[PDB]
Each structure stands twice: as structure tokens, then as C-alpha cells.
Design a binder for this molecule. Structure first.
Ligand SMILES: COc1ccc([C@H](N)c2nccn2C)cc1
Length: 330
């Protein structure tokens, strides 16, 4: 089998992407944030504290003839940005772009933190990291991809995120019309539960490529590109007036600037992030200070190839017995 679903930016900055997902019988369609950096499929629901729901579409398990309480199971997750959610668990039928999984753990939120409440466009998350990170207790649950994998034509999914435009998540096949050139594959470590890989270096604008190993994760659920402070300083030094602001929480730059591109290495191949992808707009409405899309990972503890990087590529998440990651230009 295969599935194919369009993913759409939630706002004009590409702060995140939502993909429609059918849950239950009859189907309840929720718009979920597909997140290769976590491993829980959780939704706003009829159980979510009413004051914490503000415009989201909710899953109502009592209206699904295929929903079953997973008795005794609870979940609780805290994300790198400080947001969090928790609740109980149902199993139900879940379909993405025509690909159906029966018995999928659907984690129903009883509580969500303020950042989730305040984002009316995201009805929940669909985790696509390794199932060893799933938070359900006392019986850990499998991701949608892990449950689908044996049925898929090929044990893979692909992320093709758009810049200011819709893109695509495919399951079970590589669309050879969706990228240019060849796909370069690179090794993955699953030891931390992430799609963790090592970039071979970087360049800033038209500058010379610096060969250096950068270990990080491919994370569709993180907006920005977080890299070591040395790399990030070298980037922003090429932008007149750019500076790290402790009050704002990162690098800012004059909104009047034209940003240079940023290139990262995948083996001997190179992915170029255009400068415009690195502009996240005014720090507050009407400000002439703009927020940078490349930020330091110092204090996170891991480098993160988030949407800024991944949307410059066609990315293959290869879940074969030995997982790997592929990147192509597009
Ligand atoms: C301080 O300046 C900022 C802060 C945030 C954004 C943007 N709306 C966003 N939401 C989630 C992630 N990002 C980048 C843009 C400028």
C-alpha cells in the first residue's frame, strides 16, 4: 500500500505545516502537525479541558464505532520548546492520504499547554520519530509509520515541504518526479530515538565550503535550523547589522537586509537554503527588526535540521532494518 497527503503551512511564515488525517468511523478529519522529532499521535478531543480549546477541531471517541479505550494507558509529553500535553489513550482507525492503519494509538489530550491552545490551526501532532520515544505508559505504543510499515510497498516516508506553498508527505514510495538529480543517503543513529545524522559541513552564501561534522536531527516539527554557535556566528556575520539579542531570544537582523543562502553537506552532496527561507519577519508587528531562521543550538543539547533546512530538500525517511536518511535537491 501507499499514502499521499498534502501538507500546508499554517501561516505566511511557514511556522509549521498541517496535514489532514482521518480518525475513526465515520471519519473525523483533524489537521495534524507531522513531527519527525517526536513519537506520539495526540489530538485535541472531547476530553480536553474546555478552557484550553480555542478553535481547534476535536476528536470525539464516543462518536467513533471503531474507538476503544486503551485501558489504563496515559501519556505525557514535553517538547523542546517548553510546550506540553497529556491525557489518556484510545485505539482507532487512522488514515493518511489513503493509507489506513487499524488499531492505532490515538492519544486524547486532557490538558495542553498555552502554546497549543493559542494555535487554532493545529489539532494535534502525528509523531514520526522512532517508537522508542513514545510516551504512553505502562505499555509503549507504536507510531503510525511503524504500524503501517509492513503493509507499505517500501518501508519509507518522504517529506517535501514547500516554501510559502503546500507540499507533500508520501508513505511507501519515492516520487521520482518530485526532486532533481539524485538522492544522497546518509547514516542514521537511532540511539536517541531521533532521525539523527551527521552533516559533512556548510557554506555561507558564495563562500567556500567548510568540511566539518555536524551531528543533528531531521525534525519536521521544529520551525528553524539550530546549529553550533560557531556556524551561526559565521552566518550572521555576513549580514550587516545582525546581532544576537538576549531580550528577543536569538539572532535578529534589519528587515531591510537581503540574506545570504546557507548550504549544508549531505555526504559529498550539497543542499542550498535560499536566503529568503531564513527570514522570519518582524519580531513584533511593525518592527524593523526581523527574526533569523538560523539560530544557535547552544543550550538545547542537540543540533536540529528543522523546517528551514528540510524544505530546501526532498527528504527520504528510510525505515528499513538499518534506517537511513536521503536528501535531494528539488
Ligand atoms: C521574535 O521573533 C519571532 C518569533 C517567532 C516567529 C514565528 N511566528 C514563529 N512561530 C513559531 C516559530 N516561529 C519562528 C517570528 C518572529
Amino acid at each position: 500500500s501507499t499514502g499521499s497527503a498534502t501538507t500546508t503551512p499554517i501561516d505566511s511564515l511557514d511556522d509549521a505545516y498541517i496535514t489532514p488525517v482521518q480518525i475513526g468511523t465515520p471519519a473525523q478529519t483533524l489537521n495534524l502537525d507531522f513531527d519527525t522529532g517526536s513519537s506520539d499521535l495526540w489530538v485535541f478531543s472531547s476530553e480536553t479541558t474546555a478552557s484550553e480549546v480555542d478553535g481547534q477541531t476535536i476528536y470525539t471517541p464516543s462518536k467513533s464505532t471503531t474507538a476503544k479505550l486503551l485501558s489504563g494507558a496515559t501519556w505525557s509529553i514535553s517538547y523542546g520548546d517548553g510546550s506540553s500535553s497529556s491525557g489518556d489513550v484510545y485505539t482507532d482507525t487512522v488514515s493518511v492520504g489513503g493509507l489506513t492503519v487499524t488499531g492505532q494509538a490515538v492519544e486524547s489530550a486532557k490538558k495542553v499547554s498555552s502554546s497549543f491552545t493559542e494555535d487554532s490551526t493545529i489539532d494535534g501532532l502525528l509523531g514520526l520519530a522512532f517508537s522508542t520515544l513514545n510516551t504512553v505508559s505502562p505499555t509503549q505504543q507504536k507510531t503510525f509509520f511503524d504500524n503501517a510499515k509492513a503493509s507499505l510497498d517500501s518501508p519509507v516516508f518522504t517529506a517535501d515541504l514547500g516554501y510559502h506553498a503546500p507540499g507533500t508527505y508520501n508513505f511507501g514510495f519515492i516520487d521520482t518526479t518530485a526532486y532533481t538529480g539524485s538522492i544522497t543517503y546518509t547514516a542514521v543513529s537511532t540511539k536517541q530515538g531521533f532521525w539523527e545524522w551527521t552533516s559533512t559541513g556548510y557554506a555561507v552564501g558564495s563562500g567556500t565550503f567548510k568540511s566539518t561534522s555536524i551531528d543533528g536531527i531531521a525534525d519536521t516539527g521544529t520551525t528553524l535550523l539550530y546549529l553550533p554557535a560557531t556556524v551561526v556566528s559565521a552566518y550572521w556575520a555576513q549580514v550587516s547589522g545582525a546581532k544576537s539579542s538576549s531580550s528577543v531570544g536569538g539572532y535578529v537582523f534589519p528587515c531591510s537586509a537581503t540574506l545570504p543562502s546557507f548550504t549544508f553537506g549531505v555526504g559529498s552532496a550539497r543542499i542550498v537554503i535560499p536566503g529568503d527561507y531564513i527570514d522570519f519577519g518582524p519580531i513584533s508587528t511593525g518592527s524593523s527588526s526581523c527574526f533569523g531562521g538560523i539560530q544557535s543550538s547552544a543550550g538545547i543539547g542537540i543540533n536540529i535540521f528543522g523546517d528551514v533546512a528540510l524544505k530546501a530538500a526532498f527528504v527520504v525517511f528510510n525505515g528499513a532494518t538499518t534506517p537511513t536518511l536521503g536528501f535531494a535537491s528539488k
